[PDB]
């Protein structure tokens, strides 16, 4: 059917690494699934699609920003103006991508979850994309984005603490991204370290609960948790 | 810092 | 002014890895230079821009084609049909990209080329993009593409043999791509191997006898030539 055709097209777009089209296909899948919930597979295809589309503009934004600061530190103000105009184009694309996924998540998927599985997943994703907004927005828009991020992550954390094993890859990913939020967005290294440490310990504490299928996913995140701590614990030094 | 895949 | 602005924008697009925009910027620089030659730097920015823009569709095309063949081997005609529609979209983009750069080479850059270095460079590039056309075109369209590739490479090779040192990275790159043309498009491995070998020997002749500053580039190309010969035979 509609749904199945566009799911397959989305998988093809992924293979071809034509991710803007993958988002289009998954947006058509999600729209075709109105009352029903997305499958685990469709949820993951949607997430991969948006992660890659935003990831590419995020990379470009960081690079153009480094160049902007260097050329600004230099007396070529003429170069700096051009770089700022270009970064503005990138920020426009970033804003439009976040608006697309936040509306789709906010209008269909979050209301439709009622699974706690998917509740935490979609809440984490809402927080993620508000955070990607907070990465480049300024003034009140940055404030609003960061506040919505914190609120999304908190709601996610409540459902996850109450209904997901400490070794659950969704709960672990949420902890990871929430800690990153504190370190990078809120500039609270103490808070970020505390949260990452807690999520790791609570997962090795109850490390029996982990699933064979769940293991590659969880262990990956837990290593990232340690890796973050490894840098933070060293920037509590540097 | 790194985030979830 | 204009020219210098768009060169800078192209470098920014490259840094940002926004290559469709890099192509746009280099098309505006080249269009803004009527009759004058591109600098070596500008020429290379243009080539990088188009190389990356086409490279990405070439990769997508190969992957979608493999999936089409597997799904064909599975009797999944619904999947095969969807895949064919998608591959057709990719081939449309491929055709338009090769056409864009071929038009730019044919109306301004190839006519404007004033030295053997740039004459060979732009002819080699013409052969390259006719070859990328020949990679997916079929039937008569493929025959026409391959013939234009051969003609571009031949013109390039004549100028290169006549005005560029055998160790010139432009001449070496041309020899490399011409041999590849024989192996992959014309399925003439004997010719591909012979061409790569002759170009390599002619390059090793003056390897120690001559060279400075150019050496990392030439030695690089000659090593790719060796790797290919090692694989073909
Ligand atoms: Co608000």
Numbering used by the authors:
A (entry chain A): 3 to 240
B (entry chain C): 1171 to 1175
C (entry chain B): 3 to 235
Show passages lifted from the paper.
Brassinosteroids (BRs) are vital plant steroid hormones sensed at the cell surface by a membrane signaling complex comprising the receptor kinase BRI1 and a SERK family co-receptor kinase. Many phosphoproteins of the BR signaling pathway, including BRI1, SERKs, BKI1 and BZR1/BES1 can associate with 14-3-3 proteins. In this study, we use quantitative ligand binding assays to define the minimal 14-3-3 binding sites in the N-terminal lobe of the BRI1 kinase domain, in BKI1, and in BZR1 from Arabidopsis thaliana. 14-3-3λ and 14-3-3 ω isoform complex crystal structures reveal that BKI1 and BZR1 bind as canonical type II 14-3-3 linear motifs.
